[PDB]
Each structure stands twice: as structure tokens, then as C-alpha cells.
Amino acid sequence: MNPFASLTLTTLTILTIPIMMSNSNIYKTNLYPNYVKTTVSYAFTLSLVPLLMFMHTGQEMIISNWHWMTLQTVELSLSFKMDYFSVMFIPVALFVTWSIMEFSMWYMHSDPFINRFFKYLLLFLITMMILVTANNLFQLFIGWEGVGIMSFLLIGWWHGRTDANTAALQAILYNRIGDIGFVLSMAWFLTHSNAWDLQQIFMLNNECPNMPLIGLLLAAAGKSAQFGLHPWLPSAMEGPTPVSALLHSSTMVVAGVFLLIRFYPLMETNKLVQTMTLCLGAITTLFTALCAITQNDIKKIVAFSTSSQLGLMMVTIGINQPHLAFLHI
Amino acid sequence: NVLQIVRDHWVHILVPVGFVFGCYLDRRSDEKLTAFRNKSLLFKRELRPNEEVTWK
Amino acid sequence: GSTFVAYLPDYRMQEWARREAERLVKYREANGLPLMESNCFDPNKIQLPEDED
Amino acid sequence: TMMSGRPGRVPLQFLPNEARSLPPPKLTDPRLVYMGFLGYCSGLIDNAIRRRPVVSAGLHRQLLYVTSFVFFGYYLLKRQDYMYALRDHDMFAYVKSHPEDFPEKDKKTYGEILEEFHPVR
Amino acid sequence: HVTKDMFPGPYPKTPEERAAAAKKYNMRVEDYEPYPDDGMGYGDYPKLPDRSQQERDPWYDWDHPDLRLNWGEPIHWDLDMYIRNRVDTSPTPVSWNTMCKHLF
Amino acid sequence: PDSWDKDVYPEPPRRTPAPAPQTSLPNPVTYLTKIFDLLVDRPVTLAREFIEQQHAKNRYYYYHREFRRVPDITECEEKDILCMFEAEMQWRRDYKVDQEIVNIIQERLKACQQREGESYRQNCAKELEQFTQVSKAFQDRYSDLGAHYSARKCLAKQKQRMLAERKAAKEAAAA
Amino acid sequence: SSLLDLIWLETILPKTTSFIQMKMSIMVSNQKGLIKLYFLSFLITIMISMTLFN
Amino acid sequence: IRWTYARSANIYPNFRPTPKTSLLGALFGIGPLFFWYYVFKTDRDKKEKLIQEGKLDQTFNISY
Amino acid sequence: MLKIIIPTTMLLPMTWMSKHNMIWINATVHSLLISLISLSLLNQLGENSLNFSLTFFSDSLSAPLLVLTTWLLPLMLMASQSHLSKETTTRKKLYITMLILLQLFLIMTFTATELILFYILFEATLVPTLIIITRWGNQTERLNAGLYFLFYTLAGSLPLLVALVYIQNTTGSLNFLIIHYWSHPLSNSWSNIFMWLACIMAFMVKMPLYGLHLWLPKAHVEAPIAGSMVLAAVLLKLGGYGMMRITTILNPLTNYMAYPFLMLSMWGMIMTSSICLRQTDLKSLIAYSSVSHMALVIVAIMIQTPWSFMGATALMIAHGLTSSMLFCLANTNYERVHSRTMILARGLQTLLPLMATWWLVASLTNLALPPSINLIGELFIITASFSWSNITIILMGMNMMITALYSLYMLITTQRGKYTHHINNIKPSFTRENALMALHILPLLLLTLNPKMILGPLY
Ligand SMILES: CCCCCCCCCCCCCCCCC[C@@H](O)O[C@H](CO[C@H](O)CCCCCCCCCCCCCCC)COP(=O)(O)OCC[N+](C)(C)C
Ligand SMILES: CCCCCCCCCCCCCCCCC[C@@H](O)O[C@H](CO[C@H](O)CCCCCCCCCCCCCCC)COP(=O)(O)OCC[N+](C)(C)C
């Protein structure tokens, strides 16, 4: 009954099957990329249905199936949130990943390790799915670190190239700088609101203080390549073109903006953090556009364009219009 | 070959024999700490018609 | 060993505590009692030292 | 403790007569087993030093080592148990004979005892 | 299979010990300059230029192409600083002071 | 389902609207729901009925352990180790039960927040009040005890709190 | 790495102890074997114990 | 081999205590410790003073 | 508990009377069986403990460490199986005897319901370790490392004997149950201050605390693979385990007596993480990483909050497994390379791919990647420290960043890049090494499913 939960879980489940089959026989043939592409397309077509049901009715739901552990008065359970944001962002990401994998089936035909490349792409997609549909801060952190590790692994695809290793380490460094603020926010929320779940966080903080929002903004700036920690996004273009097209262009780099979107009931209650995030977005978008105005490498120009767009959606967050930022995403 | 593999594989029983010996020792050592059996203020229970001791 | 550890009997009394809490909350909500009591031990049994200062 | 000058002590007696009033240690006492193990270790070390097959050079010698160690361990355990029994007997007798120095404590209940509470923050 | 004399030693004061140390490190005597005899324990280890390892001749046929090294030369005291994966001192089109001024 | 009690986990009557098709265009949602039901729910239902009828052929029960009440640490001698042990065990069990009570209240609060949607700030005042009361009681009871907590430390904290509140009340009355 | 871990932390606890015990061992064990000095020290300690511990 | 030996095992035998080395050691090994001790002592003193005054709003601070 | 101690003792006659070409098989099989049997201790209850007898008791803190200790020995045998090929039968049997004695002493140490027995076995676990370090070591500096490891531990632990005997004379008993139940506050006096210092320093020297860690790099570098693994996996947890047990008597002195050690650890974790960045050696780098993690555990223990204790226990178990795996990988590289230098062999991922993915997984686990128990312990400790003071987050985050940096530096330098040209003895990896690292890593990814088994008694 109510197929919303069943289908919304089933898309994320079917996205995992080729990872399980990676040790089977099909992994050793040339049929694997087509298998992964077909799996992604089927997952997208299946996830298209909850979007229709939400559009018809306005369907929202959270599922807490597996109860991981209880620490005194705190419970950690594998809980997924299937609100408008997740149920709308899943099909877009799946569609883009399907197109990118079909393109990669032609771009990377000469790579001996193409099956491993497709497996890494699927792992990144699974981790981004985890991050998007997360409901408690710990699952969000799981996805947050998984996407960073996948970006590290895919940036340095060519191990012989020294610049690839340098860029991967640089991206990891900046993402850890963001994770500092993420961990600060997580600790503050647990120690003050006594829960990592978004529901209790939203109830218990009518006037959220400066520190947790500061930490969240720092993490969003770290992962969304804002002005303070921008260069990792332009320098992450040492990876293969499909990786840059999928990870560091449209899906992985919007994780910080998505995090700021998710905590919008708390951002409204504070006026200083809104000012700071608006200023950060404005300065970073102008700086990256000005840098792109004179670049000579095409991938560099598109990377700086991505950075400018991320700055624009951060500005959108600054003026208290999170839904418009989601639309722009 | 019987009585020949024993001269080479008699050592494999040492650990299992010691494990059984240790279980017996644990039971014997437990038998000396029955000074409060069925006398605790919380688990005090009336014996069944066919039980002699609450636990061994 | 992993299967044995997974199916270890609940000696930590996690379900027992949940059932006891359910019964306590139901009883205290039915009769209007104020759920948790701020005093762990009843004041009557406790004897205080009179200062008279 | 210094029970050397204890009255009514035979100068050179290993086990006084009153020591026969105590239960003798069982032949399966763990300490006796440890004496046997020490004797076996001594036998193995003797075999090793003389450059002989360590485990199976002299069975009679190892048996004699174990038996002598067990004998001395048994008698030593008897003497030790007697001495500890004497110590406890003297302690209880002296406590009984001097009630002034060992007054009965006024029993108290935690309900009427004020202990300082140091919070952890 | 290395003799005790091949290992580094104390800071040499006499010119004879300086020449022996310079010969040990496979470098010219007047091209060898040890660290100043301060408290720190550099000893008689040559003070190679603070030149990085990214700006070495990239077209030369090195024995270790990735590290841009040849078998047997004296190794910079701070090689793990300059491995092309870390800080490098390549000259820039714009001067350092002007770069700092503009960015600030 | 009867697996969980309704009084301890309250749920509103969940009133829902009726379909009022304004147009003649067939909505894909109804067709998708029908096909999903026909080709998903029926096999799952049949498998579950088979499993349940297999369970019914072999039925056995498990019981909930009941613990007697034992004297607290308040009626415990200074050095009576056995009564101290019994009271300490009882206090630990009560601590676990109170933790589960707080967990119950938190679960109800989170459910109220997600159910009410965009009016959660108004419709869930009662759950927030209950959580505030229970949280204040729990904090007054077991907070700041330390890692090596014990019944004696909780009793000492209660004694100190009662001393402070008695002094405050006496000062207010004599003011 | 060098100044704190490899120089000063080594100088404080282990190296200072090693140097002190080495110097004291050199001082104590360096006796010429002459009984004249031995018996003079014996007389000195006899006088010290007679006039100090009473 | 010479580089590794000079970096690892040839530092102490060539070390001499001088004004520069002693001052650097004292500063870089003592100053941070006392700085952090002062900072954390001040923070905890302020927090405990606020708790004693009762004006901290420690509600919902159940887990610690 | 004798069902654990007796088979471990019986392991010695089996090893000594086995055939000259079958000692390793018997030792491995029966150590694995002993670990399987010892797995039963994990069923602890929310009440006091599993009081087996008057001498041995098991808690929910002693159970995970006991399981890890019993599980380590087969891995030690598999790691030591390689470099002892050219050894005589008697010396191999002596090596296995030393390993079995170490396991038995650790097993008796971890339960040890009386504190004097705990101290006796805690100091007894030193002799086999010193013999292993100073006898079966390759480098000529093994003697100095053995002397440092002996004296740094013994000088710290000697005052603990006097303190424990004094506590027995005043309190009247050193049984841990009686000590816990009859605990009384310690007045702020000089005598109590020095008793606190005596009771604390003996364990703080072993973890170790920053400033007393000079013995750890030497002991870990100069020891053989088995010695390095047992040092980094279990022997470091002795101090942490001891501190949790002995902390109860001290209150409320610790509330202000923990400041110097808190500062030392919260700065030494940063210092050692930074040191890891500039290293010319692999085993030394892993040793300094172990020092940083143990400093974090020291902070957790000194904070004395429930979340601190759970995070501490999780971090001890996770770090033990991770560092044992890292030392295994370093030894596997060193055997082929015969040099033990990070930059000497490069680009091994082209030649050994399965070794490369083992390296990647080990580095990720060391990097504290969610949802591995490493990050569980890390995050619990960070939250507890934040509750202690809001400024600790700066130090903790800096430590996290530097840890990630040096872990990925270790991975990149030895795996990525162009291979070294003048090395042509990189034989394909055996089945033994792959099985060893698989058995190292799988328990971590299995424990991340059931964290409650390794979260300590305050769960
Ligand atoms: C190669 C490519 C992949 C191929 C493989 C495909 C298959 C995919 C599966 C891989 C992971 C998928 C995740 C699925 C998890 C389902 C199982 C899980 O739910 O069970 C866990 C249980 O697992 C165990 O708890 C974890 C294992 C225990 C760890 C011990 C390690 C083994 C000993 C070895 C030595 C130990 C060294 C360290 C000592 C501390 C959680 O238990 P719990 O949710 O509560 O409820 C269990 C049922 N109850 C209600 C009756 C109690
Ligand atoms: C090197 C690697 C690390 C090793 C371990 C280092 C940790 C050990 C350091 C010991 C911690 C502090 C020791 C004493 C702390 C008590 C607080 C005291 O120091 O402050 C004042 C004490 O005043 C002075 O400090 C008196 C002591 C001065 C002499 C001590 C030596 C100080 C410097 C030497 C440090 C050397 C440490 C390493 C030795 C090798 C407070 O004055 P007061 O309120 O009235 O007294 C409070 C105590 N009462 C309540 C019992 C009365």
C-alpha cells in the first residue's frame, strides 16, 4: 500500500545491483558498460513515478526502517527523507548520469579499465543518492564523505600523471576544510537539540544561534567551491571529461548548496548568516566569472562557469529563496 | 594408517581436551560460590515440586 | 562467529526496558501523573541535616 | 607480626601438636599441583643441561624430582596453613579481650548521610 | 654494504676535512657548502640550493623521471618538500611582491 | 496493527480528501497504482499468507520478565555491601527505563513534526511541552553524574538540590 | 620533528639520565684499590655516625 | 642511504645547546601548551561562573 | 574463564611436540579455534558483569579487547611465517612460545579482578615483548629500542606499585568491585595530588602521552612484524584500559588535575600528525599515527563523560585493527624491497593491483571514513570534547585534516606514479599476504554493522 515508499526505496536499491555483480562473470567482458547504462535508465524510469504521485497529491514521507543503535536518549536509524527536494532531484540526477554514461561508452572506448570506470561512476551516483535522500545528519555525513572519496578516486584516474594526484589531494584538502565546519555543526546540534534527526532539529530550534549555522555555511562553502576554497573545482579538471561532466559540473558540486537548502527553516530565523552567505555568493560568482572571462582552456572556462552558477545559487540562498535555488540547481 | 597417524597426530587433541578441562574447572569453581543460591532479595523463588536447586 | 554474534540473545535488556517504559508511560498518562518525576528517591525516606543557621 | 616470641612455642618444631586440629590440604590442591609442575620443570632443565633427550632421558629421575617437590610442598602447605590459623586466632582473641580499643560502630543509613556532590562538566 | 666513512659526520672546520667531505658527497670541493654550525644537527650535509624539483630540466633523461633525479647525486635535505606533488619554486610571469599586493 | 499500543503512540484520525476529477484526462497515477497493485501487492500478499499459515502450524510463546522491588540506597547501611549491590542494580534498571521513556517522547515529537507539515510550529505545542517537561526532569535526575555514575552520586545530587531549594524557600518565606 | 622530537625531548628525560648515571658510575667505581684511602674513609664515617646520629 | 641517515639518525650527535636552539626549543615547545591552557581555563571558568549564576539556558542538554 | 586460559596454555605443549614442518599449521588452526571459543564473551548484560570467579571477571569493556587479543595471534603467525623460513626448528618453536606467552599474559591481564594481579600481569607482558624485539630484529638499533621500551615503561610503572599497596593498606581491598562500590572523594591535598600522579603516570607512559612517546617509534621500527603488530594493536590499549578502571577512585581531583595532560595530548596529536607529513620511513610514520590516535584516546579518557568512554573504546579497537593492517602492508613491501624507505619503491599499483586496493582500504579506514567505527569513536570523542569546551573543535578539525593529508600522502607516494626503474624483484603477491590483509580488514566492515559490541559499558 502507498507505493511511494516502495518505489522510492527500490530506485536506490536497483542502483546497487551492478556493484554486487562486479565480482561476477559479466564484469570481465565488454557487456558491463551497457549493463550499467541500462540499469541507470531503468532506475530513472522507475523513479519517475513518485514524482508524478507527488505532483498529483503533494506526497511527503520519511522511512525509518533499520534501527542502527541507541545511545542513551539518542537513536540512530537508517532513515530516508522523501520530501519534494529528494523526490524531484532523483530523476534529474539519474537522467544526467544516464546521458553521461552513454556518452562515456563512446568517449572512453580505448581505456582498458573502462568497466572499473563505470563501476566508480555508479558508486558515486549511489553515494550522491545517499546524501540527497538522507534525513539524519550522520547519513548526510556518510554521503558527504563518500562523494569526496569518489571525487578523489576519479580525479586521479591516470595514476602516472603527477598533476592528477596533486589535484586529487588538493580536492581532499579543501573538502576536509569544509568537513571541519560540518563536524562542528553536527556536534553542536547533538549537544544542544539532543538529536541528529532533522525533525527534532527543526522543532527544538525556533531561534537558531550563530555557531551551527556558521558550521553549516562553512561546510557548504567547502563543498560548493566558494571564494575562500574555490581553486579545487577548477583544478579538478585533470580527470576524464565524463567525470568532470558528471561530478564537478552539475551533481556533486551542488551538495553544499543542497545542504543549505535542507536547513532553510533554521536559516530564516538568523539574519547574520544570511548576510554572510549572500556576500560569499556574490564575491565568489564575480571572481569566478572574471577569471573565466580570459581563460584559454575550454574545460577551465566551463569549470569557472560552474563555480559562478554555484555562487549565484548561494546568493539565492542569501535572499531567503531556497526553492528558487533548488530550481536553478 | 591406524596407530601410525596417532604417533604424528596425537597433538591435535590437546587444545580440545584443555577446553573441556577448563569448562569442568569453571563448573567446579562455580560450585563453591553457592552461598546465596535462592536467597537473593530479588530472585527469591519458591522451589518447584521436583527441583532441588535453583541453578547449578 | 558473525552469525552467532548477530543472533546473540538480548541480555542487555533493550526490549525489556522498552516494554517497561511503555507500561510506565501509559499508566502515568492515564492517571494524569506528570510522566518523569524530578526526584529519583522519595523525600520521606531521605533525612536532611538541620542547619538552624 | 613477629610471632617468634609467642608463648608456649617449641623452639625447633616444624608442626606443633595443635596444628593437627586443622584440615590437611587435599592431595589435589592447586598448590601441590604447582609443586609437581615445578619438579617436572626441574627435571626437564636437568635433562637439557646434561645434553640428553629433554622429554625422555630419565623417567625415574623426573619421577623422583616430582615426588620430592610434591612431598616438600605438602608439608610446607601444612605449616603455612597452621601459621595463618594461629594469626587469625590471636587476632580474634586480642580483639575480644580489648573491647575499649575496638568499639562497635554506630551503624548509619545513607538516607541521613550528607556526602558532597562534585558534578562532572 | 656501505662503509662507516660514507655516512655523514660532524661539521668540518679544517679545509682537509672539508675536501674529504666534498669528495664523499660526489661534488666539487668549492661547489660544496655545508650548513652553518648552529645548534641544529645538520652536520656536514651540503646546503644545496633551495631550488625546487619541478623546475629541473623536464627533457633530460633522468634515472627517475617522475622525481627528476639521477642515480647518485647528493639529495637535497628537503627533497620530500619538493617532489612536484608539493611546494615548488618555479619562476612566475609576475613578481611575488606585486602578486601579494594585488591579491591583498 | 495491534503490535504496538495506540495510547502510548497516539495517532490522529488522518482524514483524507476524495477524488474530484475536474477533467476527462485519465491521470497516470490511478492507472499506475492499479497496475502496481495487480502485479506487486498480490504476489506479496500470497507469499505472506503462506508464511503466516506456516507459522500458525507451530505456535509458541515468550514472556516478559517481571522484577521485584528491592530497598533503595536511601534505606541502605553505610557498609552493607549486599544491600548496596541490590539497590545499585535497581537504580541501573530504573535509569535504563527512564532513558527509554525519553526515547518514547522524542519519537512522538518527531512524528508530530513530520506529520503536521508546514504548520508544525502550531499543531505540535503539546508534544513540545511534554518533551520539555520530561527533558527537564531527566536533566535534574541523571545529568552531570559523570562517567562512573552510581546510586550514591545521584542521591548526593538530590540531597544537594533539596538543600538549595529548602534554603531558597526559607529565605523567601522569612523575607 | 627535529628540534622537539629528536633533540630536546631526547635531551630532557633519557639523555640527561644517561649522562648523570654515567658520570656517577665513573665517580663511584674509580678507586685506586689502596686501603689507605679506604680506611681513612672508614674513620671519617665512624666519626660522622658517632657525632651525628646521637 | 646517506640522506635518510642524515635526516633521521645523525641529528642528536651533532646537536649543541646554544641561545638560538634553546630559545627556539623553549618557545615552540612550551608557548603553545601554556597558551592553550590559558584559553581553555578562561573558557571553562566563564562557563562555570555562568552555570553557578544559572543564566545559561541549558535546556535539552541531556547527552553530555 | 578457564575455558580460555587452559587451551592457551595447552598451545605450548602442542607447539613443542609437533613435527618440524607442521608447527605453523597447528598453531594457526588452534589459535583460530581459541578465538572462536573466546567469541562467546561478547554476550554481556546491562547489569554489573560476568563474574566468573573470585579471580577473573569480564565486563563489556574487557570483552572486545579480549576478542581482539585472541584474534590477533593467527595473524601474527601468518605474518611471521615468511622471515623465519631459514630458521632452525628450536628457534621457531621459541618464537611461537613467546607469542603464546604474550597472548596468555594479555588474556590474564584484561580481566584481573584484583588490581595487584592486574599490575603483575601488566608488567609481566613486557618480558616476551622485549625478547622478541631484541632477538628477532634486523636492524642494529634493536638493542637501544629494547632498552628504551623497557625503561620508559618500568620507570613510570614502579610508583604505581607503591600507590596500589598504599591504597590497599588504607582502603582495605584492591578488588575492583569493592573499590567501585566503596569509592570516596579525594580531598585536594599534596599527598592526594602525588597519589593521583603515581596512579596515572604509569598508564599515561604506555599509551603514550606526548613527551613520553620517544620509545614508541624505536620499538615499532626495530621490532619484527609480529612485535610491531602486537605493540600497535593490543599493548597500547593496556594503558587506556587501565586508566578507565583506575579513574573511579580519584574524583574529584581529576576535574582540575587533568589540565596538563589534556593540553599535552591536544597539542601532541597536532604535532605528531604534522610529523607524519615529513617522514622518510613508513613504519615510523605509522607509529606516529598510532601516537596521535592514542593521544585522542587520552583526551577522551581524561574528559570523563559517557560519550567519551564509548568513543574511546571504539577508537581503541578500530585503531588496533587499522594499525595492524598498515604494519602488515609495510612489512610486505619491505620484504620485496629490503630497504624500508617510502620513496625508494614507487608506482607499485601498476605491478600489484590487489595490494593497491588493500592499501586504499587501509588508508581510507585510517582516514576515519564513515560509517567505519574509526569515525564512530572519533565523532563521539569530538562531541564530548565540544561539550567540555567549544574551542576544542579547532584542534580536532586540524588533526582530522592533517590525518587525511598524511594518509593520502602515504597512499600516493607508494602506489601512484611511475614505477622505479632499477627494481626487478617485485614478485606477484602470495596468497598468504592477501589472506592476511583480508582477515585484517573484514572484521572492521563487519563490526560497523553492530557497533554496540564495541561501545563499552556506558552504552
Ligand atoms: C564482491 C562484491 C560484493 C559481493 C557480496 C554481495 C552481498 C552484499 C552484502 C554486503 C553488505 C550488505 C548489508 C546487509 C546487512 C544485513 C545484515 C545485518 O542487518 O545484520 C547485522 C548483524 O551482523 C552482525 O551483528 C555483525 C557481525 C559481528 C562482528 C564480529 C566479527 C567476527 C569475529 C572476527 C574477530 C573479531 C575482531 C574484532 C573484535 C572486536 C545487524 O544486526 P541487527 O540489525 O541488530 O539485527 C539482527 C537480527 N536480530 C534482530 C535477530 C538481532
Ligand atoms: C615532560 C613530558 C610530560 C610529563 C608529564 C607532565 C605532567 C606533570 C605536571 C604536574 C601537574 C601540576 C602539578 C601541581 C598542580 C597543582 C596546582 C599548583 O601547581 O598551582 C598552585 C600551587 O602553587 C605552586 O605551584 C606550588 C608548587 C611549586 C613547585 C612545583 C614545580 C613547578 C614547576 C616544575 C614542573 C616540572 C614538571 C616535570 C618534572 C620532571 C596553586 O596554588 P595553591 O592554591 O596554594 O595550591 C593548590 C593545591 N592545594 C589545594 C593542595 C593546596
Ligand SMILES: CCCCCCCC/C=C\CCCCCCCC(=O)O[C@H](COC(=O)CCCCCCC/C=C/CCCCCCCC)COP(=O)(O)OCCN
Ligand atoms: C617516563 C618517566 C615518568 C616518571 C614518572 C615518575 C613520577 C610519578 C609521580 C610521583 C611518584 C611518587 C609518588 C609516591 C607514590 C604515592 C603514594 C602516596 O600517595 O603516599 C603519599 C605520600 O606522598 C609522597 O611521599 C610523595 C613523595 C615524592 C617522592 C618521589 C618524587 C618523584 C618525582 C617528583 C616530581 C615528579 C612529578 C612530575 C613527573 C612528570 C614525569 C617526569 C601520602 O603520604 P602520607 O604519609 O600517607 O601522609 C598522610 C598524613 N598527612
